[PDB]
Design a binder for this molecule. Structure first.
Ligand SMILES: CC[C@H](OC(=O)N(Cc1ccccc1)C(=O)Nc1cc(OC)cc(OC)c1)c1cc(-c2ccc(OC(C)(C)C(=O)O)cc2)no1
Ligand SMILES: CCCCCCCCCCCCCC(=O)O
Lengths: 267, 11
Protein backbone atom coordinates (compact mmCIF):
# COMPACT_ATOMS: atom_id res chain seq x y z
CA UNK A 1 0.00 0.00 0.00
CA UNK A 2 0.99 3.69 0.31
CA UNK A 3 2.82 2.97 3.57
CA UNK A 4 5.19 0.47 1.95
CA UNK A 5 5.92 2.97 -0.82
CA UNK A 6 6.81 5.58 1.82
CA UNK A 7 9.10 3.10 3.58
CA UNK A 8 10.84 2.48 0.21
CA UNK A 9 11.21 6.24 -0.37
CA UNK A 10 12.77 6.74 3.07
CA UNK A 11 15.03 3.71 2.73
CA UNK A 12 16.29 5.13 -0.59
CA UNK A 13 16.78 8.63 0.89
CA UNK A 14 18.88 7.33 3.78
CA UNK A 15 20.96 5.24 1.37
CA UNK A 16 21.29 8.23 -0.94
CA UNK A 17 22.62 10.36 1.98
CA UNK A 18 25.17 7.59 2.80
CA UNK A 19 26.31 7.18 -0.83
CA UNK A 20 26.66 10.74 -2.11
CA UNK A 21 28.74 13.11 0.13
CA UNK A 22 27.66 16.32 -1.62
CA UNK A 23 23.83 16.59 -1.70
CA UNK A 24 21.62 18.93 -3.67
CA UNK A 25 20.90 20.59 -0.27
CA UNK A 26 24.59 21.27 0.45
CA UNK A 27 25.17 22.43 -3.17
CA UNK A 28 22.24 24.87 -3.20
CA UNK A 29 23.45 26.33 0.14
CA UNK A 30 26.90 26.89 -1.42
CA UNK A 31 25.45 28.39 -4.64
CA UNK A 32 23.02 30.80 -2.90
CA UNK A 33 25.55 31.80 -0.23
CA UNK A 34 23.09 30.68 2.43
CA UNK A 35 25.89 28.58 4.00
CA UNK A 36 28.01 29.91 6.87
CA UNK A 37 30.86 28.08 5.10
CA UNK A 38 33.63 29.73 3.04
CA UNK A 39 32.74 30.78 -0.53
CA UNK A 40 34.12 28.51 -3.33
CA UNK A 41 37.12 29.67 -5.37
CA UNK A 42 35.89 31.09 -8.71
CA UNK A 43 37.64 29.81 -11.83
CA UNK A 44 36.86 32.09 -14.79
CA UNK A 45 40.09 31.89 -16.89
CA UNK A 46 43.44 30.12 -17.19
CA UNK A 47 45.07 32.39 -14.59
CA UNK A 48 42.33 31.69 -12.02
CA UNK A 49 42.45 27.93 -12.82
CA UNK A 50 46.19 27.91 -11.97
CA UNK A 51 45.76 29.91 -8.75
CA UNK A 52 42.92 27.63 -7.61
CA UNK A 53 44.91 24.36 -8.13
CA UNK A 54 45.93 24.00 -4.44
CA UNK A 55 42.28 24.64 -3.30
CA UNK A 56 40.65 22.34 -5.95
CA UNK A 57 43.33 19.57 -5.75
CA UNK A 58 41.30 16.44 -4.95
CA UNK A 59 42.85 13.77 -2.67
CA UNK A 60 46.32 15.31 -3.03
CA UNK A 61 46.43 14.19 -6.69
CA UNK A 62 49.06 15.99 -8.80
CA UNK A 63 49.78 15.81 -12.57
CA UNK A 64 52.95 13.92 -13.57
CA UNK A 65 49.54 19.21 -20.50
CA UNK A 66 47.35 22.09 -21.83
CA UNK A 67 44.44 23.40 -19.69
CA UNK A 68 41.66 21.75 -21.74
CA UNK A 69 43.29 18.35 -21.20
CA UNK A 70 43.91 18.88 -17.49
CA UNK A 71 40.28 19.90 -16.95
CA UNK A 72 39.10 16.75 -18.79
CA UNK A 73 41.46 14.62 -16.65
CA UNK A 74 40.12 16.10 -13.41
CA UNK A 75 36.62 15.49 -14.66
CA UNK A 76 37.66 11.85 -15.19
CA UNK A 77 38.80 11.37 -11.57
CA UNK A 78 35.48 12.81 -10.35
CA UNK A 79 33.44 10.66 -12.73
CA UNK A 80 35.17 7.50 -11.47
CA UNK A 81 34.27 8.36 -7.94
CA UNK A 82 30.69 9.09 -9.09
CA UNK A 83 30.55 5.62 -10.63
CA UNK A 84 31.69 4.07 -7.35
CA UNK A 85 29.12 6.03 -5.36
CA UNK A 86 26.31 5.15 -7.85
CA UNK A 87 27.31 1.44 -7.66
CA UNK A 88 27.08 1.54 -3.84
CA UNK A 89 23.69 3.27 -4.00
CA UNK A 90 22.39 0.74 -6.56
CA UNK A 91 23.24 -2.16 -4.24
CA UNK A 92 20.98 -0.57 -1.61
CA UNK A 93 17.98 -0.66 -4.02
CA UNK A 94 15.82 -3.56 -2.72
CA UNK A 95 16.09 -6.49 -5.13
CA UNK A 96 18.96 -5.16 -7.22
CA UNK A 97 21.67 -7.42 -5.75
CA UNK A 98 19.36 -10.45 -6.27
CA UNK A 99 19.39 -9.84 -10.06
CA UNK A 100 21.70 -11.81 -12.35
CA UNK A 101 25.17 -10.25 -11.89
CA UNK A 102 25.47 -9.75 -15.65
CA UNK A 103 22.27 -7.69 -15.58
CA UNK A 104 23.55 -5.62 -12.60
CA UNK A 105 26.56 -4.79 -14.82
CA UNK A 106 24.42 -3.88 -17.78
CA UNK A 107 22.10 -1.67 -15.71
CA UNK A 108 25.06 0.25 -14.22
CA UNK A 109 26.82 0.53 -17.52
CA UNK A 110 23.90 2.22 -19.31
CA UNK A 111 22.57 4.02 -16.24
CA UNK A 112 25.63 5.73 -14.67
CA UNK A 113 25.89 8.51 -17.27
CA UNK A 114 22.22 9.34 -17.05
CA UNK A 115 22.61 9.61 -13.28
CA UNK A 116 25.85 11.59 -13.49
CA UNK A 117 24.06 14.24 -15.61
CA UNK A 118 21.09 14.22 -13.25
CA UNK A 119 23.38 14.78 -10.28
CA UNK A 120 25.58 17.29 -12.13
CA UNK A 121 22.47 19.52 -12.49
CA UNK A 122 22.31 19.82 -8.67
CA UNK A 123 25.78 21.47 -8.89
CA UNK A 124 24.97 23.87 -11.74
CA UNK A 125 23.27 27.18 -12.28
CA UNK A 126 23.02 29.11 -15.55
CA UNK A 127 26.42 30.78 -14.83
CA UNK A 128 28.61 27.81 -13.86
CA UNK A 129 29.23 24.60 -11.96
CA UNK A 130 30.48 23.64 -8.52
CA UNK A 131 33.55 21.43 -8.55
CA UNK A 132 35.85 19.60 -6.12
CA UNK A 133 32.99 18.92 -3.74
CA UNK A 134 31.84 22.54 -3.65
CA UNK A 135 35.32 24.06 -3.10
CA UNK A 136 35.48 25.62 -6.60
CA UNK A 137 33.04 27.25 -9.00
CA UNK A 138 33.93 27.04 -12.67
CA UNK A 139 32.17 29.55 -14.90
CA UNK A 140 30.15 28.45 -17.89
CA UNK A 141 31.84 31.02 -20.12
CA UNK A 142 35.28 29.72 -19.14
CA UNK A 143 34.24 26.17 -20.15
CA UNK A 144 32.81 27.51 -23.46
CA UNK A 145 36.05 29.34 -24.15
CA UNK A 146 38.14 26.14 -24.22
CA UNK A 147 39.43 25.15 -27.69
CA UNK A 148 37.27 22.79 -29.76
CA UNK A 149 35.93 20.19 -29.33
CA UNK A 150 36.39 20.73 -25.52
CA UNK A 151 34.70 24.17 -25.81
CA UNK A 152 31.34 22.64 -26.72
CA UNK A 153 31.65 19.64 -24.37
CA UNK A 154 29.94 20.99 -21.21
CA UNK A 155 27.44 23.35 -22.86
CA UNK A 156 24.85 20.57 -23.53
CA UNK A 157 25.01 19.65 -19.84
CA UNK A 158 24.21 23.28 -18.84
CA UNK A 159 21.14 23.50 -21.12
CA UNK A 160 19.82 20.27 -19.61
CA UNK A 161 20.57 21.42 -16.10
CA UNK A 162 18.73 24.77 -16.37
CA UNK A 163 15.47 23.06 -17.46
CA UNK A 164 15.81 20.16 -14.97
CA UNK A 165 16.54 22.48 -12.03
CA UNK A 166 13.26 24.30 -12.68
CA UNK A 167 11.38 21.18 -11.44
CA UNK A 168 12.80 22.07 -8.00
CA UNK A 169 13.39 18.51 -6.88
CA UNK A 170 15.08 17.89 -3.56
CA UNK A 171 17.30 15.01 -2.49
CA UNK A 172 14.37 12.87 -1.27
CA UNK A 173 12.79 13.08 -4.76
CA UNK A 174 16.11 12.55 -6.60
CA UNK A 175 16.90 9.47 -4.57
CA UNK A 176 13.88 7.65 -6.08
CA UNK A 177 14.24 9.09 -9.56
CA UNK A 178 17.81 7.81 -9.73
CA UNK A 179 16.73 4.33 -8.65
CA UNK A 180 14.06 4.42 -11.43
CA UNK A 181 16.79 5.16 -14.02
CA UNK A 182 19.02 2.31 -12.84
CA UNK A 183 16.17 -0.22 -13.03
CA UNK A 184 15.40 0.35 -16.73
CA UNK A 185 14.16 -2.88 -18.36
CA UNK A 186 14.95 -1.67 -21.89
CA UNK A 187 18.75 -1.50 -21.65
CA UNK A 188 20.37 -3.43 -24.55
CA UNK A 189 21.53 -6.95 -23.80
CA UNK A 190 19.57 -7.60 -20.61
CA UNK A 191 19.16 -11.35 -19.96
CA UNK A 192 16.06 -11.31 -17.73
CA UNK A 193 13.87 -8.16 -18.02
CA UNK A 194 10.94 -9.24 -15.78
CA UNK A 195 12.40 -8.94 -12.30
CA UNK A 196 13.99 -5.58 -13.35
CA UNK A 197 10.58 -4.26 -14.48
CA UNK A 198 8.92 -5.58 -11.29
CA UNK A 199 11.34 -3.50 -9.19
CA UNK A 200 10.94 -0.45 -11.45
CA UNK A 201 7.15 -0.62 -11.19
CA UNK A 202 7.42 -0.30 -7.42
CA UNK A 203 10.02 2.48 -7.68
CA UNK A 204 7.80 4.41 -10.11
CA UNK A 205 4.81 4.17 -7.71
CA UNK A 206 7.08 5.26 -4.91
CA UNK A 207 8.25 8.22 -6.99
CA UNK A 208 4.71 9.28 -7.96
CA UNK A 209 3.58 9.21 -4.30
CA UNK A 210 6.72 11.07 -3.20
CA UNK A 211 6.13 13.84 -5.71
CA UNK A 212 2.42 14.16 -4.71
CA UNK A 213 3.36 14.32 -1.00
CA UNK A 214 6.47 16.52 -1.26
CA UNK A 215 5.21 18.93 -3.99
CA UNK A 216 1.40 19.00 -3.43
CA UNK A 217 0.92 22.25 -5.35
CA UNK A 218 3.14 21.09 -8.26
CA UNK A 219 0.66 19.39 -10.57
CA UNK A 220 1.99 16.73 -13.04
CA UNK A 221 5.56 16.89 -11.67
CA UNK A 222 5.69 13.04 -12.02
CA UNK A 223 4.87 13.27 -15.76
CA UNK A 224 7.27 16.19 -16.36
CA UNK A 225 10.00 14.18 -14.72
CA UNK A 226 9.35 11.03 -16.82
CA UNK A 227 9.75 13.07 -20.03
CA UNK A 228 13.22 14.25 -18.87
CA UNK A 229 14.21 10.55 -18.45
CA UNK A 230 13.75 10.17 -22.23
CA UNK A 231 15.78 13.40 -22.87
CA UNK A 232 18.68 12.19 -20.66
CA UNK A 233 19.37 9.39 -23.13
CA UNK A 234 20.11 12.03 -25.79
CA UNK A 235 22.56 14.01 -23.67
CA UNK A 236 24.19 10.57 -23.12
CA UNK A 237 24.28 9.45 -26.79
CA UNK A 238 25.53 12.94 -27.77
CA UNK A 239 28.11 12.76 -25.02
CA UNK A 240 29.29 9.28 -26.10
CA UNK A 241 29.77 10.52 -29.72
CA UNK A 242 31.91 13.43 -28.52
CA UNK A 243 34.04 11.08 -26.46
CA UNK A 244 34.44 8.90 -29.54
CA UNK A 245 35.55 11.99 -31.51
CA UNK A 246 38.14 13.08 -28.90
CA UNK A 247 39.49 9.57 -28.38
CA UNK A 248 40.56 9.66 -32.07
CA UNK A 249 41.58 13.35 -32.38
CA UNK A 250 43.51 13.62 -29.04
CA UNK A 251 46.30 11.08 -28.57
CA UNK A 252 47.66 13.20 -25.63
CA UNK A 253 44.90 11.84 -23.34
CA UNK A 254 43.15 8.56 -22.62
CA UNK A 255 40.37 7.14 -20.49
CA UNK A 256 40.53 5.72 -17.01
CA UNK A 257 39.98 1.91 -17.30
CA UNK A 258 36.65 2.04 -15.38
CA UNK A 259 35.36 4.59 -17.93
CA UNK A 260 36.71 2.36 -20.73
CA UNK A 261 34.63 -0.53 -19.34
CA UNK A 262 31.48 1.61 -19.42
CA UNK A 263 31.94 3.35 -22.78
CA UNK A 264 32.90 0.31 -24.85
CA UNK A 265 30.04 -1.40 -26.75
CA UNK A 266 27.78 1.55 -25.80
CA UNK A 267 25.56 3.28 -28.43
CA UNK B 1 34.66 -8.54 -19.17
CA UNK B 2 33.78 -5.50 -16.97
CA UNK B 3 36.39 -6.53 -14.41
CA UNK B 4 36.29 -3.38 -12.30
CA UNK B 5 32.44 -3.14 -12.30
CA UNK B 6 32.21 -6.79 -11.29
CA UNK B 7 34.71 -6.05 -8.56
CA UNK B 8 32.74 -2.99 -7.31
CA UNK B 9 29.48 -4.98 -7.46
CA UNK B 10 30.84 -8.05 -5.60
CA UNK B 11 32.79 -5.89 -3.07
C1 LIG C 1 43.59 21.75 -14.17
C2 LIG C 1 43.07 21.36 -12.77
C3 LIG C 1 42.46 19.96 -12.82
O1 LIG C 1 41.39 19.96 -11.84
C4 LIG C 1 40.03 19.76 -12.11
O2 LIG C 1 39.58 19.95 -13.25
N1 LIG C 1 39.21 19.34 -11.08
C5 LIG C 1 39.82 19.16 -9.75
C6 LIG C 1 40.47 17.89 -9.66
C7 LIG C 1 41.88 17.79 -9.71
C8 LIG C 1 42.54 16.56 -9.62
C9 LIG C 1 41.79 15.39 -9.49
C10 LIG C 1 40.40 15.47 -9.44
C11 LIG C 1 39.74 16.70 -9.52
C12 LIG C 1 37.84 19.12 -11.26
O3 LIG C 1 37.16 18.76 -10.31
N2 LIG C 1 37.27 19.28 -12.50
C13 LIG C 1 35.94 19.13 -12.76
C14 LIG C 1 35.48 19.72 -13.95
C15 LIG C 1 34.13 19.65 -14.35
O4 LIG C 1 33.69 20.24 -15.50
C16 LIG C 1 34.46 19.98 -16.68
C17 LIG C 1 33.20 18.99 -13.56
C18 LIG C 1 33.62 18.40 -12.37
O5 LIG C 1 32.73 17.73 -11.58
C19 LIG C 1 31.52 18.40 -11.21
C20 LIG C 1 34.97 18.46 -11.98
C21 LIG C 1 43.61 18.94 -12.50
C22 LIG C 1 43.86 17.76 -13.09
C23 LIG C 1 44.95 17.23 -12.50
C24 LIG C 1 45.55 16.06 -12.79
C25 LIG C 1 46.12 15.30 -11.76
C26 LIG C 1 46.75 14.08 -12.04
C27 LIG C 1 46.85 13.58 -13.34
O6 LIG C 1 47.51 12.37 -13.47
C28 LIG C 1 48.03 11.74 -14.68
C29 LIG C 1 46.83 11.08 -15.43
C30 LIG C 1 49.02 10.64 -14.23
C31 LIG C 1 48.81 12.72 -15.60
O7 LIG C 1 49.58 13.55 -15.05
O8 LIG C 1 48.69 12.58 -16.84
C32 LIG C 1 46.28 14.34 -14.38
C33 LIG C 1 45.65 15.57 -14.10
N3 LIG C 1 45.40 18.05 -11.55
O9 LIG C 1 44.56 19.14 -11.53
C1 LIG D 1 31.06 14.04 -17.41
C2 LIG D 1 30.66 15.40 -16.80
C3 LIG D 1 30.44 15.29 -15.29
C4 LIG D 1 31.45 14.38 -14.59
C5 LIG D 1 31.99 14.99 -13.29
C6 LIG D 1 31.26 14.48 -12.04
C7 LIG D 1 29.82 14.93 -12.05
C8 LIG D 1 29.07 14.27 -10.92
C9 LIG D 1 29.74 14.48 -9.56
C10 LIG D 1 28.51 14.54 -8.66
C11 LIG D 1 28.92 14.25 -7.23
C12 LIG D 1 27.58 13.92 -6.53
C13 LIG D 1 27.06 15.10 -5.70
C14 LIG D 1 25.82 15.70 -6.42
O1 LIG D 1 25.96 16.03 -7.62
O2 LIG D 1 24.76 15.87 -5.75
Amino acid sequence: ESADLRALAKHLYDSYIKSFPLTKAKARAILTGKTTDKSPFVIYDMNSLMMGEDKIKFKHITPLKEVAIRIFQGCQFRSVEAVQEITEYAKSIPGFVNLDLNDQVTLLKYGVHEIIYTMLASLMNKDGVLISEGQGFMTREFLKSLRKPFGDFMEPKFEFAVKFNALELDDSDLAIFIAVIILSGDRPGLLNVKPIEDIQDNLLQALELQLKLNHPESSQLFAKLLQKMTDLRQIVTEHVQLLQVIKKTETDMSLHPLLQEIYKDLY
Amino acid sequence: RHKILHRLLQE
